[PDB]
Amino acid sequence: KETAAAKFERQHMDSSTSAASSSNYCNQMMKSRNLTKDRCKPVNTFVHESLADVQAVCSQKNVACKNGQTNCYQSYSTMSITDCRETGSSKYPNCAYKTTQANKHIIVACEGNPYVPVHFDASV
Numbered sequence: 001k002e003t004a005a006a007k008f009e010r011q012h013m014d015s016s017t018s019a020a021s022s023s024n025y026c027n028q029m030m031k032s033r034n035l036t037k038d039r040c041k042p043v044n045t046f047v048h049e050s051l052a053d054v055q056a057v058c059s060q061k062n063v064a065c066k067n068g069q070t071n072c073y074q075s076y077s078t079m080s081i082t083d084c085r086e087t088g089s090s091k092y093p094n095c096a097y098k099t100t101q102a103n104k105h106i107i108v109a110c111e112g113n114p115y116v117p118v119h120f121d122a123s124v
């Protein structure tokens with residue numbers, strides 16, 4: 001299919017832009033990264049930092065994942081992120097999302113060799 005590291009990049013990386021501008025950013029990106037394909041994914045975060053800066057988080061602050069696993073890492077500083085949340089009215093296949101741009105720390109789960117991000121856990 002897609003490796004776990006490639007799937008994480010397709011779903012969460014957006015380094016071409018420094019930040020979301022229109023309230024339309026999430027509807028466009030969720031569609032173009034195929035996250036509304038079989039359903040509307042309810043929550044998805046896009047990170048506007050270089051891939052290298054996000055991968056560096058795997059060697060930063062070790063914290064437990066929401067699942068109780070302990071291979072989660074929190075970035076020491078904040079990063080530009082865009083939170084995409086499905087609206088209460090949205091209905092597959094007419095998926096609608098609310099866009100929220102912010103600067104927060106991210107929490108990612110890392111794995112393999114090289115040890116890289118394979119899952120976006122939360123933003124704080």
Ligand SMILES: Nc1ccn([C@@H]2O[C@H](COP(=O)(O)O)[C@@H](O)[C@H]2O)c(=O)n1
Pocket residue numbers: 011043044045066119120121122123
């Ligand atoms: N702040 C958040 C919370 C979850 N997510 C996405 O939602 C998926 C499922 O969320 P859970 O962490 O709730 O399992 C995550 O794998 C991640 O792709 C996200 O992108 N941003």
